[PDB]
């Protein structure tokens, strides 16, 4: 499932942390704000609206159930946007579920617009040229910056199964 | 691996304390098993982050922490 896949790749936090670009994050890779904001009063205010109850603390916490709710909403927003995208959508419809999960994993990490930048990879996947797709994904700066996760994801694209996640 | 104490703590403690512990566990496993991967692991932790490994390291009984090196840098 995507929940077990993204829990592994994104970790699980019940208290805010800041990602490598400085953005406040919580749960399973849930971006609270798309600014590099350190203001806890601002962070708490936004997170309170997102989970449905007043968050206090420096930092405050959410419950495990709130983390799951945030993830389920995040995953649906992404899945909705990946099918509708004019470039990524056609590829998603043409590949099997394992490979859809690989594209959804990338979209969760970098956004659909980020996935849309892999023109050579996506063109190769639509053509069924999995070796060229694999090589294009591992040629990228994304592979150099998050090599463990990108190795797992590109291996799905190459092989068509989920063995790189132990499945 | 699973450790009840480290699991909940890594989910809730201050980020700097948690990432100090995560990096220490990872680097200790690198030095024990694959010392030549030290520079690559350090590079990957800086460019890719370290918080995300809290679940596999402390919350997942089915993940063998010896495999954390390949989790950070890819298949060996």
Numbering used by the authors:
A (entry chain A): 175 to 341
B (entry chain C): 23 to 98
Paper excerpt:
One of the T4 early gene products produced immediately following the genome injection is gp61.3, also known as Spackle. Spackle, along with another T4 gene product Imm, confers the infected host E. coli with resistance against secondary phage infections—a phenomenon known as “superinfection exclusion”. Our results show that T4 Spackle forms a stoichiometric complex with the lysozyme domain of gp5 and potently inhibits its enzymatic activity, whereas Spackle does not appreciably inhibit the cytoplasmic T4 lysozyme (endolysin, gpe) responsible for cell lysis at the final step of the phage lytic cycle. Crystal structure of the Spackle–gp5 complex shows that the binding of Spackle induces an allosteric conformational change in the gp5 lysozyme active site and partially blocks its oligosaccharide-binding cleft.
To that end, we co-crystallized Spackle and gp5 lysozyme and determined the crystal structure of the complex by molecular replacement phasing. Two crystal forms were obtained, in monoclinic and orthorhombic lattice systems, for which the structures were refined to 1.78 and 1.92 Å resolution, respectively. The monoclinic crystal contained two Spackle–gp5 lysozyme complexes in the asymmetric unit, whereas the orthorhombic crystal contained one complex in the asymmetric unit. As expected, the crystal structures show a 1:1 Spackle–gp5 lysozyme complex. In addition, we observed several 4-(2-hydroxyethyl)-1-piperazineethanesulfonic acid (HEPES) molecules bound on the lysozyme surface, including one occupying the oligosaccharide-binding cleft (C-site)20 and another in the peptide-binding groove in the monoclinic crystal structure. The protein structures of the three crystallographically independent complexes were essentially identical to each other, with pairwise backbone room mean square deviations within 0.5 Å. Spackle binds to gp5 lysozyme primarily via three short helices (α1, α4, and α5) located on one side of its flat helical bundle fold. The interface buries a total of 952 Å2 surface area and involves numerous polar contacts. The side chains of a number of basic amino acid residues of gp5 lysozyme, namely Arg181, Arg182, Arg187, and Lys189 from the N-terminal lobe and Arg312, Lys321, and Arg326 from the C-terminal lobe, are involved in intermolecular hydrogen bonds or salt bridges with Spackle. Superposition of Spackle and gp5 lysozyme structures in the complex with their respective unbound state structures shows conformational changes for both proteins upon binding. The partial loss of disulfide linkage may reflect the conformational strain in α1 helix upon lysozyme binding and resulting bond breakage or preferential binding of Spackle in the reduced form during crystallization. These observations suggest that Spackle–gp5 lysozyme interaction is mediated by mutual conformational changes, likely via an induced-fit mechanism.
